[model samples]
Target: TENLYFQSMSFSGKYQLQSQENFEAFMKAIGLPEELIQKGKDIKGVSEIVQNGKHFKFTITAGSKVIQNEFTVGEECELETMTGEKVKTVVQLEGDNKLVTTFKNIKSVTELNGDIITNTMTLGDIVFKRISKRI
Candidate 1:
């Protein structure tokens, strides 16, 4: 007779990148070379997330690059970043529904609303935002 916890516990799914903002500026600010930036501009990546209560697994794909990361909320783990480097970090779940973390001086927050997911990354004054829809 209770239906309040459905949406908050349903973040496990596959999603495709729908749109992005400030890709070039953010990439450049993060020290990515010009050629790598150019090559990544057109990449519409897919994110596969599997969440089990406090633990989460992410398989991210863009172009031919694949990054696999797994972590438990509030616990530190070594994550393979977009630059293909392993960085030790912790991912936090805020308000029971959002993921917050940082890797290599970049701040990233991922949130889900309905069937749409918003992923935002910030470096200095540049904010790279992405929207992904369930697939």
Candidate 2:
């Protein structure tokens, strides 16, 4: 039998940003400048992931900006935030379908279901949510 692809450990390929909510508010709350937010608010980004056992590589591309990082599950890794800050943190796996992490008091949760991925980030009462579809 084939393993389920909905499982977080099996995540790979490219996911294109479909929609976003509260993006501007959340970016402002995170100290993102207005100029940068204006440039990014309209462009849909793509996340390309490579999963290898417990290690993962992620490349996010949006217009002219690209960010890439490599990390192992349940291990500490330095990841760059949208604000261009390098944060040392640990990415945790929850159950078999969620990736959880926090940096600078903002909590991020990514949940996977088949070919769809939903990412939510919260800073106090501000919430930023995005949905991406595999391509």
Candidate 3:
């Protein structure tokens, strides 16, 4: 498939944070310790888990580009507490990427061309060799 281009990007995920045990596990994964976890748990919106079980999904949206990933729990996921205490199963989503391109040399969008676009390529070589073209 052709690569998708975008102007900006953002990410969000849905997962179950249902129980105190689950919430604590999530806190540890994100480096939030017990004291902070306790404080965060009291916050009305912060402790709330938006999705759970078989319905969990994570999404990244970048202008017209969108990617969604879903997963199911085989066994409960656990994490350690500040005092080395193990917490119960908590499902969490981690790591997301967004691509936003800004052209420095181009004065206008109309000036965009294959060569100009290729100049910003970072993932692969700068070679202009094309294996195939539609026209």
Candidate 4:
């Protein structure tokens, strides 16, 4: 007989931008360009990165503009064969942005995959591991 288990988890972390240089470096690693950084300089706020096991999502909110840009990357279960294969999926959330920029342009090479199960099961069964961000 096959045994089944379902669980959900969520965790959050914050990283503060100690200085302009640290901010630039972090942004650069995430594919943020120089021009956009300049525009976002006045945009004081925090950036958030959410993780569900191996899946991850990122968002940036500007305090001054009250704008939010969000993007998600994760593995989706295409079939129930139990081969344990994962297909990449991207989801974008829309919101107001005084800054004109698209997160898609700055692609991060992070290959996020779910450590737990990634299946089209009941929504309640879906497990969310962690949610983190650099302050």
Who wins the lDDT comparison? 2
Candidate 2, pairs of clashing residues? none
Q: Model 3 Cα RMSD, Å?
A: 21.2
The lDDT of model 1 is 0.81
Residue 68 error, candidate 2, Å: 1.1
Candidate with more favorable, higher TM-score: 2 or 4: 2
In model 4, what lDDT does residue 87 have?
Answer: 28
| Candidate 1 residue pairs in backbone clash | none
Q: What TM-score, computed on C-alpha atoms, does each candidate reach? A: 0.86, 0.89, 0.20, 0.29
lDDT of 3 by residue, 27-47 (tens): 444455566666655332111
**lDDT of model 2, residue 40:** 85
lDDT ranking of the models: 2, 1, 4, 3
Per-residue CA lDDT of candidate 2, range 10-123, in tens?
778899999888989888887877888888887897898888866889898643368888888778989988767788889888888788998899999988899998889999
Off by over 4 Å in 1: 1-7
Prediction 4 global C-alpha lDDT: 0.31
Candidate number with greatest TM-score = 2
Over 4 Å off, model 3:
1-21, 46-135
Candidate 1's residue-wise lDDT over 1-135, tens digit each?
874332244678999988889988886776667787787787897889999877788898743467788998778888887775788899877775689998877999998888999889998788989899988
Clashes of 2: 0
